[PDB]
Amino acid sequence: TTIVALKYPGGVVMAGDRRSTQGNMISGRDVRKVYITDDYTATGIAGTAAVAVEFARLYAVELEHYEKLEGVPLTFAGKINRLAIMVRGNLAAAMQGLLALPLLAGYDIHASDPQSAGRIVSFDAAGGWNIEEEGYQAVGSGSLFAKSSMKKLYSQVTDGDSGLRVAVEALYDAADDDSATGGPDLVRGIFPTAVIIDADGAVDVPESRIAELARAIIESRSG
Amino acid sequence: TTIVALKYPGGVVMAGDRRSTQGNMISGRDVRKVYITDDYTATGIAGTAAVAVEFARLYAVELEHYEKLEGVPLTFAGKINRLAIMVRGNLAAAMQGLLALPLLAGYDIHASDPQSAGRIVSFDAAGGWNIEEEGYQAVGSGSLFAKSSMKKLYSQVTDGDSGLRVAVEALYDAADDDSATGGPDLVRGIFPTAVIIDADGAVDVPESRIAELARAIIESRS
Amino acid sequence: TTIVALKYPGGVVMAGDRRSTQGNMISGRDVRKVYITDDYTATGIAGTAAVAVEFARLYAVELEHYEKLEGVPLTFAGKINRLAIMVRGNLAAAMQGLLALPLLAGYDIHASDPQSAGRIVSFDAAGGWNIEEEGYQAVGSGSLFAKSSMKKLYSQVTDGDSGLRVAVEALYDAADDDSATGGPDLVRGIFPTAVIIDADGAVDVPESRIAELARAIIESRSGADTFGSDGGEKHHHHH
Amino acid sequence: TTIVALKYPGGVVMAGDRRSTQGNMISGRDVRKVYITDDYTATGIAGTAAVAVEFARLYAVELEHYEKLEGVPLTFAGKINRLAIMVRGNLAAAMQGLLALPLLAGYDIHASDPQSAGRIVSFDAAGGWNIEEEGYQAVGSGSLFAKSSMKKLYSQVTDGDSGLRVAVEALYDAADDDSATGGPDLVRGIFPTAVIIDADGAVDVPESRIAELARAIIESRS
Amino acid sequence: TTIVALKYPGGVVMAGDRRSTQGNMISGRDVRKVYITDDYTATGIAGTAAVAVEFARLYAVELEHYEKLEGVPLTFAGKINRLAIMVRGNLAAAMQGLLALPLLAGYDIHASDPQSAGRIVSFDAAGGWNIEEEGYQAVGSGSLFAKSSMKKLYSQVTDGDSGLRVAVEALYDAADDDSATGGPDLVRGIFPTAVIIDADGAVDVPESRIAELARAIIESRSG
Amino acid sequence: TTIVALKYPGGVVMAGDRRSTQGNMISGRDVRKVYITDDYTATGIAGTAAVAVEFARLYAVELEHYEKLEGVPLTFAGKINRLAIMVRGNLAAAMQGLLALPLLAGYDIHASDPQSAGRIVSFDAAGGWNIEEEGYQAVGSGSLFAKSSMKKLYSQVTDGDSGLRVAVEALYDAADDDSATGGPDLVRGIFPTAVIIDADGAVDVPESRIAELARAIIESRS
Amino acid sequence: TTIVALKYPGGVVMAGDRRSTQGNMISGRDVRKVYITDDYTATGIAGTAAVAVEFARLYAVELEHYEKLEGVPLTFAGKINRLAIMVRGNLAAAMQGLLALPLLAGYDIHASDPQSAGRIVSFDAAGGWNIEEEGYQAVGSGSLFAKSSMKKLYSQVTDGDSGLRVAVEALYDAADDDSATGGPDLVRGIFPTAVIIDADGAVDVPESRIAELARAIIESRS
Amino acid sequence: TTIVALKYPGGVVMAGDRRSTQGNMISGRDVRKVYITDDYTATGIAGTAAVAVEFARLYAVELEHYEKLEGVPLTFAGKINRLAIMVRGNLAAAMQGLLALPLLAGYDIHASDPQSAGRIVSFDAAGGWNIEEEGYQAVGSGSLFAKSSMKKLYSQVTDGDSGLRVAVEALYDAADDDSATGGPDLVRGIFPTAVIIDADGAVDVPESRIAELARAIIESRS
Numbered sequence A, E: 001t002t003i004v005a006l007k008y009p010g011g012v013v014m015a016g017d018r019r020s021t022q023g024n025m026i027s028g029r030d031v032r033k034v035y036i037t038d039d040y041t042a043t044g045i046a047g048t049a050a051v052a053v054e055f056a057r058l059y060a061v062e063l064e065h066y067e068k069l070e071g072v073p074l075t076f077a078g079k080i081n082r083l084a085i086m087v088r089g090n091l092a093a094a095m096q097g098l099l100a101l102p103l104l105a106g107y108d109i110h111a112s113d114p115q116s117a118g119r120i121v122s123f124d125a126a127g128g129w130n131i132e133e134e135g136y137q138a139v140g141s142g143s144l145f146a147k148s149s150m151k152k153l154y155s156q157v158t159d160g161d162s163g164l165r166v167a168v169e170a171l172y173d174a175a176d177d178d179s180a181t182g183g184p185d186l187v188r189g190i191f192p193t194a195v196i197i198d199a200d201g202a203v204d205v206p207e208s209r210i211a212e213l214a215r216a217i218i219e220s221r222s223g
Numbered sequence B, D, F, G, H: 001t002t003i004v005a006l007k008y009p010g011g012v013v014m015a016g017d018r019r020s021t022q023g024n025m026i027s028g029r030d031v032r033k034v035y036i037t038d039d040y041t042a043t044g045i046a047g048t049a050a051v052a053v054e055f056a057r058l059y060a061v062e063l064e065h066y067e068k069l070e071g072v073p074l075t076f077a078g079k080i081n082r083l084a085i086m087v088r089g090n091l092a093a094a095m096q097g098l099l100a101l102p103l104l105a106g107y108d109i110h111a112s113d114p115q116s117a118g119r120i121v122s123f124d125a126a127g128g129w130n131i132e133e134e135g136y137q138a139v140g141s142g143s144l145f146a147k148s149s150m151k152k153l154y155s156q157v158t159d160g161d162s163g164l165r166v167a168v169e170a171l172y173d174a175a176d177d178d179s180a181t182g183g184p185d186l187v188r189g190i191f192p193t194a195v196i197i198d199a200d201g202a203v204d205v206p207e208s209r210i211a212e213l214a215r216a217i218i219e220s221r222s
Numbered sequence C: 001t002t003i004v005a006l007k008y009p010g011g012v013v014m015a016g017d018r019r020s021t022q023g024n025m026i027s028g029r030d031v032r033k034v035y036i037t038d039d040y041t042a043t044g045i046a047g048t049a050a051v052a053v054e055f056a057r058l059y060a061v062e063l064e065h066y067e068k069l070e071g072v073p074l075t076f077a078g079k080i081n082r083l084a085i086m087v088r089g090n091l092a093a094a095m096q097g098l099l100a101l102p103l104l105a106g107y108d109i110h111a112s113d114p115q116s117a118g119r120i121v122s123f124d125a126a127g128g129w130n131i132e133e134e135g136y137q138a139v140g141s142g143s144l145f146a147k148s149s150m151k152k153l154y155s156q157v158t159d160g161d162s163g164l165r166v167a168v169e170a171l172y173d174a175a176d177d178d179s180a181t182g183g184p185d186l187v188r189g190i191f192p193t194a195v196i197i198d199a200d201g202a203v204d205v206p207e208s209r210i211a212e213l214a215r216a217i218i219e220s221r222s223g224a225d226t227f228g229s230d231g232g233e234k235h236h237h238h239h
Ligand SMILES: *C(=O)[C@]1([C@@H](O)[C@@H]2C=CCCC2)NC(=O)[C@H](CC)[C@]1(C)O
Pocket: A001, A002, A019, A020, A021, A022, A023, A031, A032, A033, A045, A046, A047, A048, A049, A052, A053, A140, A141, A180, A181, B024
């Protein structure tokens, strides 16, 4: 698994691979690992699928629940805290192998400066969180490969589209070096999924845009 | 890893993938796992990379050693026995994680009927061997996928070329389902290696022929 | 054990073998592993026999329970969630050798496009589920053999009968390679069971069509075996 | 695995199934488990395949080795003792999972009464042996089913052919109840192998004869 | 990690490095480990990030909670006891690898002599506390190097400014000998954080001030 | 520790960091980890220092020993085999926490094409070796960061100087992400060491050249 | 750690060292280990710092709590029992390494004979207590050294001042032989603390008096 | 234990504390840990006393043995290697708890520049050695304190006497923070021992010079 997230001027993008495995066996090729959790946030999760999925589903319900009860959404800091508490609650199970780690991306409508209102937050198994300041982050078995790739490509990020391209290329580098991360599948037409979030909210990136970027990356390296 | 071998009218073909890993990490993309061990035999090995390479190397030396000392090569049965003894000798080390399992393919110049002189032999960790009679075999983490694929494609094998095509497609199916087996890499131009053996001896299959077959398999599935 | 499920234009079919074992011993030859759980869904279970039967029985009760209480059946997504929660609830027991894994097949009456309303969903021990979209799935010790077989035969599925045939052939290939899966028993007349589900609902497939399909698969392999050889050599002859 | 042996008036018959497995997986369908070890004896072996084959191969060499060195074959009791010593020698390996148990069938040319010169001997992991006196014996995971079947069918053995039939039916019952034992495979035409030994020596039973008995048992149960 | 604290005439200073690691990997470069917990106290924490952060957050809430309920802030001794009880409460978890150890610095408004009203308190895993009487203390994997450095530099601490400079140099020595403690990062412009507390209260030291001190220390040792 | 090696047109460069640690403690700042082992080869080693230093020293003696005894140096393949055998010989100790892994760089004087005569070989704990074909390799705790960095920078390598620059930058990237790898120390004036090998032999890269490259990388990133 | 207590005509004195350690490291030099727990009692504690401090603090609160609620202080026997019960309550934690052992010294206002109203009570991990009647006692890693020293010096105790001198010299002897007990630190001017208790109540001994005695002991041994 | 060594213009000095312990108990106050091992070298050892003494004794014999046999002393590099091999030989025992680590100080008569001919070499449990390049080193439980102290005082070393003073002060700081290292004992008149080595050879520093330095350090800190 590999999930990446990066900030660009005016927003944030999060993308994830489609592979699921059982030991060495490829058991899934179209899993979606990045979810829009509310109008301004997306959650990507690595680790045990059952827990990962529950986290994303319960977390979206909890965010909207607060909103309906209180009339206003939680502040970004409050959203982070709720995710952290949810991860912390799974600590015992995690020690027993049901370990799941989310990566949170969002756009803070209340931030002072809009161009930098993008947010990336990582979490550890005990519920510790860290608001990323370096511009990008990644979780999963291919995360180190992805991060070392973004380290070299990040300077090319100037807007949402160059942001998305660097994210897809980082996932491509993760797949190139980590057999547990799925690369673009040209035969079946399956590609990484991605969410972009800016002042207008969180939106799924259309598969055809990702397909085009992936094919370009492949062609480019083919020579 | 996946190494396959299958028999076709007049000979045998053995093909192997190119991937090496360390845990989930892809650590190699061009490893050669199939070796010509003498004029009429090829060995493909799965398992611990260090042990596999050493088995193939020592085994070829042992075969030629006998030939130079005695003036004639070992009978095919003798070749099988030496490889089995070599595997048996690694049993202790294997239980400690140094396990390697070879797959042997050959053409028996002394067999009565030439069209069926092809031989495929598999081995277990204790040195047990079995001369295959169903037409094909495979070893490695992708072997079950490869064998289930060849079970459906084998009736198409009628000569060396259709044999080669089915072998490459079996490796393609193994890579499709086993993350530890490498599929054809069109970006880097790296494909499975293969050896064909018939009455004229063992010869490495040129990469261009495999690339061709691989692209046709991919085109067909898209 | 092997349970398979596959989608065909307009529906879905699920079929299961009949073997039960205790170690190497064959302890049962007529176990039924595929259940109609409601009018539009079937459940096939692999693993610990005791837990498997209980999951199917309790799940059917839970689906009907909701229907009687609320006046309407659960949406397909809700059916999936309930089965996932039930599996998750057995996680402790499963880590202690009581593990069971279900495979769910259904027809979604509320799906937009009827020809593809067929649904196949797999589950892992922790309750994780995945709606299958490659057309087929299988669970049990013979599942890898069944899936590799279906991978090569799936392009032949064009309707319910060809789908049934392919499912039976996949079970046949699983039994051919997995000693824990039972093949067709011609001496006793026992064959895999199957359920077909389409817009008119889930129905058990009659034993006689499955028996016919099975003998046809066997005669066909018998013929191919004689036609074939080992790179030219034939080591056995039928007599 | 299931190997059976039974005495009939004037000789003995030994038959074995063809299945090899690795966990639940069927890894082989034509394995031969019964060997003619010398002119008057056959050995069938169950357990670890590597070791089983070595035993049979080494044992035949040892019997013929004695014969060439001393000019005469070992007495039947001496043949038993050598086999026992070979099994005992594998005891450490066996406790480590490489356990193989042979079943020995023979015809004693030096026995006083020819009609009963047939011999069946079983062995345990420590090298203990027992000359069977009840008429039949079996080894392997399906042995209990085979023995209970022979217990009911043994009164039908009156000569070599009815003995061969009972042995095949015992293997059929073992496969019917033990998933590790292979039944007759009508699709592939593969059947249990058998060896018959009488005053004229040990001979392999032709496959066609076993196929016919197998079909009659199946028809009869159908 | 290294957190240092030292008393100077009239107050106290606490400074912390910015590194977070996962095994040998540097996983963070801008973590803040020193928090102002109330108007007159600061808490620096080493160990498990998740527990560390939760300690500081809950501790700040608990101190203000008492103040709002009772109308007056807790005495300094009461503040120490509350932190000790919180640490003790994590002992079972700590034995499971979730260990966190705080270092408390404060200014006691009720102390008789103002020049020495500065306070430094250390804590062990069982909730034991000790009010430091030798002028400085440190916690974390680089604490012994920091303390041995302050032992030689402490006589130079005559006021809050030289106290801040020494604190920075002790952290510099900790980073020089402990790979788990981060040194000043001149390329990215990231430096240790610090808090100064005197009769006017606790205040964050501006990063620019720390950067100047760090550059000066670096120039000096260069020759 | 991080040691990197990369091929450039006409040769090869190997560079290593200078840090040694004991747990979290920095215990050394000027360790040299890259050695010229003969006129055309360099060895860099990661792992337990006592064993690493021993391996480089013993290996250079072995290479020269052969040369003096036989009158000619070992072929490159033979040099690889000797290093592999030495590593294999330490396996028991390595499972005991004494593990050391070398990285070998060389220039093959007997290679057909001089521009590509550069060689990079990696080794695993069991003595398995692999001649690298992707152009670069790295060993040590910072190796993955270094390899990911070189993957993006490798296309800039057109000669020995750009090759050296990319190697230093890879080490810089390794130190930026791995606390166990030492970055350039501007205060003390200590920098990574490097060896360049081309048709004229292996020569140590002067510290001043490395220092200029390091400063340029630092200025570039700030 | 070392805490000593001894009876003198008319009262009792308790004194403790100032060292705290973490393994071999000296982590503290001014810890106070002897507390006045009520007007007529002092408690000194050895073992886990966290537990010892909590024992002294909770115990003082419990004694005064009883006094305020009931209007009169607990009898000396009651005070002993409360401390024993508190120690017993820590048993589980103590078996887990959180072990602390108190030493209690007091003056019993209700005793018949005032010259001997001094009391010293020791405690074990399970809450067992013992009223010491031999004149002195000590707890901590240096206690055996302190007791053997007091055994030889005790006959010199004739009043409060000589009692104080013997206590300080016993702590001196403990520090002389036990690296975990701190000696008088002349450089920093830190000395053992002490509490004296007689008919007028418990009072802290001024540091200057202890420093004086310590200097005299050192002069004497020089 | 703490043993320090530092280079000064023209030579080197090595000094060690005098304490030996058994658990928390001080079991010795006058142990000598620094030995002159030949005319130009001194060895200081920490760890298990039995093994430490054996090392110093055996090593001095080995150095002189070579000299008598070959007519010339070993080069400094050879002396290092011999000590390393001796340490490596104790690795199995060290794992079992008999761990001893030497620190080597010497003056290399064959060095090009005399003012810097001083040498300091440290060793790890596996026999790994490192020629110190930053001016000083220390071994033992108080070594980190001693090194952090020398890091601040080293710029004061300008000759043999200031180097000896700084070495004594570093040992004083080690004793101040490590209960296992002995400080100057003014009551008994026992101080750290030291060896100075320059072009004229290794000589023991007279106790009176060390006593004066120690008393001055103590008064200074008072
Ligand atoms: C990824 O972390 C991975 C996925 O299978 C899993 C599936 C769906 C969404 C959550 C992530 N988890 C694992 O355990 C695999 C094995 C290493 C995986 C492919 O990495």
